[PDB]
Symmetry: C3
Subunit: 422 residues, 3 copies
Amino acid sequence: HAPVVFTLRTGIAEGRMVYIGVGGDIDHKINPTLVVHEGETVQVNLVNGEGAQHDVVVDQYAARSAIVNGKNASSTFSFVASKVGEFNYYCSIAGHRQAGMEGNIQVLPGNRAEMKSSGADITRDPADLPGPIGPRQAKTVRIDLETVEVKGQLDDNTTYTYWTFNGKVPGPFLRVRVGDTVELHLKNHKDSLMVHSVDFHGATGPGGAAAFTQTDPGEETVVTFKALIPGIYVYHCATPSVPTHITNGMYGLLLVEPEGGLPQVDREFYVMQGEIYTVKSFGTSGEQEMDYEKLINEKPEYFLFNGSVGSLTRSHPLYASVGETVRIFFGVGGPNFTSSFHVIGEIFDHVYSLGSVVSPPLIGVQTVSVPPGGATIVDFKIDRAGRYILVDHALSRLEHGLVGFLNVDGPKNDSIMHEGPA
Amino acid sequence: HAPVVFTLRTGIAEGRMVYIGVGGDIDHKINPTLVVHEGETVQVNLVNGEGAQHDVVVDQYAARSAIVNGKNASSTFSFVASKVGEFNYYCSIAGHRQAGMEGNIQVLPGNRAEMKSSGADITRDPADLPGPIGPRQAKTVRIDLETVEVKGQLDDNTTYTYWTFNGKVPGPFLRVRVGDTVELHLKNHKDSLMVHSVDFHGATGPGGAAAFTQTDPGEETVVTFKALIPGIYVYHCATPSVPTHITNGMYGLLLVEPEGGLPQVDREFYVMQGEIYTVKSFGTSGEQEMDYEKLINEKPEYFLFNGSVGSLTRSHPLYASVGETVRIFFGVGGPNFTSSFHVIGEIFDHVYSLGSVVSPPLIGVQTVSVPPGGATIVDFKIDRAGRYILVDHALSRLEHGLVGFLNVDGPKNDSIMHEGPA
Amino acid sequence: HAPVVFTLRTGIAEGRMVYIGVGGDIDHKINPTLVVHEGETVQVNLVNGEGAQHDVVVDQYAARSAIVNGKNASSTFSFVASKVGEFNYYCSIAGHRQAGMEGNIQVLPGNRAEMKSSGADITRDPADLPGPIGPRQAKTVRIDLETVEVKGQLDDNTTYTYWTFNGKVPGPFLRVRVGDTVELHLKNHKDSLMVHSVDFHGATGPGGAAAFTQTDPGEETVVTFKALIPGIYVYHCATPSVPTHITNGMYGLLLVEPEGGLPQVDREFYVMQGEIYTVKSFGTSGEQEMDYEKLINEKPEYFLFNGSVGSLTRSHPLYASVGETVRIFFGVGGPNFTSSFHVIGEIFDHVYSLGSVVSPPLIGVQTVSVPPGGATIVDFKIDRAGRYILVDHALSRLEHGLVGFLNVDGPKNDSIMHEGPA
Ligand SMILES: [Cu+2]
Ligand SMILES: [Cu+2]
Ligand SMILES: [Cu+2]
Ligand SMILES: [Cu+2]
Ligand SMILES: [Cu+2]
Ligand SMILES: [Cu+2]
Ligand SMILES: [Cu+2]
Ligand SMILES: [Cu+2]
Ligand SMILES: [Cu+2]
Ligand SMILES: [K+]
Ligand SMILES: [K+]
Ligand SMILES: [K+]
């Protein structure tokens, strides 16, 4: 999977100069044992706590941080845990290892256990969308949405109150044809504390339907609307506080197909990015709560593909085969951040700028900016095997949970890319 | 209009466990009375101050926050104040109401009073722009700007020292034809403390004219420059500190029309987005001042359309009628934030990407990313009535002042969108 | 060149009411002497420290700040230091000058000394790139990169440990033709602490080559890959922590030319933007260190073109002649911020949107958003003389080191732009 990340701050604790764990399974632990599995890439973040000179050296891997001099000075490093066994990490500054700066890394055989928590799985499988529509004539299409507030899994051993369409994040991928009439039935579950609604960016009229869909707990609201313009549209709850309903999970995509349909492709995926603003820092376990000051001042703790940490890496990666042309419908619920959407190891053959399905897509593009409340379509042929990586290329976000895998099976070496000279 | 928002934090004050108001008319008040008008959507933000378990419950409205457990934990909720009267809000956790956590919501008949302050109205009416140039050959054209420093209204009961072109924000919409020779006369009002100037993105040469227009208070500067390339351009003061002059209000748009003009439209509108960085938190009344730390580190307090809170909702909303084709000239003065410009309930028929007027517009677009120092043009046919909502879809900005209304009269229900089934 | 900036906070120090220097050569100095050279533009930022009313008045220049009233209230102003000599600056509030609020501005003849420090010059000269490839057929091209960790100059009297391709930032501009087979040899210098590697956005396959290029210090890695799709591609180090390797300087551009080559142009330039996250605030001299909290929370201290403060203003400005058509290859290493790239005084004739070289470029564009992990190409005819200014139009970044000069010699006044009436 992604690197396993450990943060260590230096300090004086239990009477000695030591390292102290930050977050994860090591939170506030003195000289924590870092437990890792054979073959994992292990990342260690060292932050200087008290202002003495420090590093971290990993005894048999010859991996080390840079030296860190003043308070807050930091160094980050990694190594592949290729050998099972127990290995010391320690500070190499004169006297510090003797003063107390030493702990263990345990490299265990086997695979890391699956993520678990007391929360429900609220992730949307990225293969979970309707396929292309027929060559139909326009018609009336009934859509059902239910709004549910649910304790969900946010990360291993970490939970959060999500608010969702149909129990997952993003909500259902809706797919209709230009000219269709949509008849929406919105039910707000009876255990909901809040009113919920929906605004479709592909709808024309008051609140994008939100003026007709403010729905009390236990009740239903119904609204009919015409789909007048093809495009790939975000939709989201539109009940005040709107950025609050959105951060909690109430966002989705609505595709309005052009008359002829989109170009035919072998496989399509559904991916949306959002932020969560928790009182505790990213990586702290337990029951997380929303922090309003962080929300309104745009200070996110979690950045997420499809609802959760590890959603598209461990829970349900994308899977395709070599030679397939693939399409990702990519949307940004937000509420706030522009995504720089990129698939590492591949190139977008076509990018539907700003979600326009009528204009000719752009050709041969590495990375696309997608604003919150915006969506695009990217298509590309997969020429060869590999683990391709979905990222927002504001790469600090990798460490706030933002990473997905597109797994394509086949040989490591081929004529498109291979080790060694030509 | 837009929800009336109240922030309550919990804590201990006057010898009891209580709610304490934050900002607005309730700042620092204990168990404050929330005064509200019939028909308003009321939003309450609860932030846990001291770490006991809390909620807010509105007696008779069946409206409540989620329970908030640790310090900083937060819950936002809203409700429509449909019934006139006096209603209790209280904490439902055992003992907390008797302990002192209770206040009153007064729902008054009629409408909320207008916004007032000891500041001048510095807002640009969105219909305040010159219309299409006729068919003309290119000619010499005189433009007059005056830089004025003025105490303006920022919000209800709140003021700020604005720096402006001609006393409003954005400055005058300038409109010339490609090939025009522009003779710009820039006067700095004698009462200004600062020198002021102007850089047009549509100008070719030193500082986009800024090298020629550094103008001492009481002086006049004159520069002539040719408009070589059609487009929709931002202009702004360019005297150091340029971000300071921009945040204070010194930005506007220059349209350089292409040869046959832009497509004819029923109505054109002029809107610009910018930020203000105050010492005090958004929503705190009184005389506001610039915070330089917040400016250079991009931590805004106010995000604004046309200069002021309520600028395009209560002061000068956009007006149009059903069936009209409408144009928005939309620019970001900034200084720093890219806008995700979106009109809730409508779809952009045409988007002039990156403000290009020569390249073919994109078709059928929900949301347009516009950088600081950039502008765009969006055109759309308004198919039906409703109140349409201009926003930056980084939606936390909603609750920092960034919202606008485009009001279109007519029935709620029609064939394009109506309540109930098809 | 760019404004000389001094920051003063007010306070009580050494027993009086005074101004105190913040950063630069005045840091923590009481009533500091601001030393400046004839003809420089001087900017003073005044920040209220203790809460009494203050301003700053420059004697004889008649330049002053606005009055600042509460703690943190700020006001910036500037003046041109046109007269050599010594001039008092003082607070005009009653009693404050006698209470101690007074210092000196020393305006010296001649030019400011060149930036110096104990660090290596790590800046890429923007003219340092290979020119257009012949109209040859596809072939095998060898590329060599070495990854080196080096103490570099960040600013005058300030250094940082940069991690680089080939000792400069950005790395070498790489230039191949679509269809080429690229044989990349990556050497990691034996004095490196870290493994380093390479991900090319122009490569197709595992990690964009990163799966094949994790290189221990003192070792080499070789990988061959085909350039399948023309485009302007970012490449960067891809060893965990990736945003750490990127912020330290490991980013560059790879052009995969289309079959015909790019349109012919008179002069090409190579510019990249990135951020540095130091423990100390921007403008603090000395040996700087990375701050991981600032990195991962996206709170930068330096925004940089080509590696360093003053890199494109004083060290290696861009130079061209009137009449030339100029091309800038512009990319954002990041790791985090999208750039609003603009050349003050010019307009882009052609913008290759999202870095697509297959799609028709956009025409007549003032400013372009470039995401981190993305690049574009902008072409423009320079019609007349002037000092043109490359900026990211999120203009607070000017004060964080983000500015560049394009120098075009010739007359100040002409038909395109001149002082006085038409
Ligand atoms: Cu140590
Ligand atoms: Cu909702
Ligand atoms: Cu929306
Ligand atoms: Cu309580
Ligand atoms: Cu000005
Ligand atoms: Cu500008
Ligand atoms: Cu004073
Ligand atoms: Cu590296
Ligand atoms: Cu990348
Ligand atoms: K491909
Ligand atoms: K419409
Ligand atoms: K030009």
